[model samples]
Target: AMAGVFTYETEFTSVIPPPRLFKAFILDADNLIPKIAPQAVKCAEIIEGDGGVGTIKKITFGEGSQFGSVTHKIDGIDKENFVYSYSLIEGDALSDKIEKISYETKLVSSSDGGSIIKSTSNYHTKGDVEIKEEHVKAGKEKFSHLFKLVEGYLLANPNEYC
Candidate 1:
């Protein structure tokens, strides 16, 4: 039997405005995200840390008996590279024994067209191994959902500056 770490990758491409212009939408957290995807995300509340090197964010989700909820802490934010990452901190009942779960998404503008969005999530399971595959699937689903939301927003509001 062989056991090791594994990661899944998914890419989404669409005709977004541009890199620098599009980056304006990516950098600002307070104003942009809350307005865009209100389904998967409810509020990005700053618990006790700022948006610096060690900011902690408590992301709240809607109620419907789906994935419950989770509060993630901001682990890394690199505006120069257009990537913001967060890890699960607390909240929800299903994540009581989760060792660690962090997620990151990067955006690269293509010279020919829109941006190439790549999202990756790393999970450290502590209790059961059978749930790892399901976790990966759920992560991928959320990635696709976000990709669609961003693409649709940019498509409709192409000239947004904030």
Candidate 2:
């Protein structure tokens, strides 16, 4: 049985276009994230299937981390809409507060010809376990920081990606 479900949405606009950012960063995250956020994600590899729906992405964290590793299953991917969804099936990121965490990230064309990135995270709590505000807040903060780091990288290397 499930205790509770919580959702958080974070959005930001970037100078990069939708297709370029989606292909390079959002879809190819397994190849790019480790290079950009080495501390948070030591490495990300596809453990099952290809890099598409039903694929399992295993992320190994550094030695200093509490959540040593996590495995996420790709739920969906829509290139036309520039959106992708995945769920955390196992890892320390689940911690003791939640049973699982699922995420959906979408990129849309902005008025200024850039792209608007919106990321949503749904946290499913364990049976009879109460979710805490601080835990949710902390998770959001960490994700926000990671987004900023990737954005900075893209901005610095404009010619590399769209």
Candidate 3:
């Protein structure tokens, strides 16, 4: 029997506006990510295509990272709606535990003029390898922290991106 696919979603509100966030960081992550998470991500650059749909981005982590690098392909992008989708295509991040991973992110305007960012992740297991609850919980926490880090950076440097 095939193992069930695991899905997770998280929503966070940031003090920074959606347009600024999307334009300054989301669309050009390669240039800004190092400022906030230098240790986690050494660099991110588009290795294939024109950086729109079908573009492939390679994210290389620091020397001590668990996974040295991972490549992601842009599957969908809606500039007007502030939505983006991508799939992890290769690297040690996959290993033998996961068959593949995909992500979807949407930024919606909030009442306070900021934005509520909703992120969803889907994890497909390798064969029948069961994913433990602890693993899921840990992964969620890690990503949550990363989101907070980005939000915090935006809050601190309000004038930079805007």
* Candidate 1 TM-score, C-alpha based: 0.75
lDDT of 1 by residue, 25-109 (tens): 5555455655786666666677777677577766666442243556667778777777777776675423534566677778777
Badly placed stretches (over 4 Å) of model 2 are: 2-4, 63-67, 95-97
Residues 1-162 of candidate 3: C-alpha lDDT, one tens digit per residue: 465567888887777778987876587577777767888678887898997899998988865475488899998999999999999899654757687888888899988898888888888776666766786677677666667767777778778766
Checking candidate 1 for backbone clashes, the offending pairs are: none
User: TM-score for model 3?
Assistant: 0.83
lDDT of each: 0.63, 0.81, 0.79
Q: Return the top candidate by TM-score.
A: 2
lDDT of 3: 0.79
Report the C-alpha lDDT of model 2 over 1-162, residue by residue, as the tens digit. 656878878887888889878877776677677888788778887899977799997888754364388899999999999999999999766867787899998998988889988889898877777667787678777766777777788888877665
What's the number of clashes in each of the models? Answer: 0, 0, 0
Cα lDDT, model 3, residue 92: 56
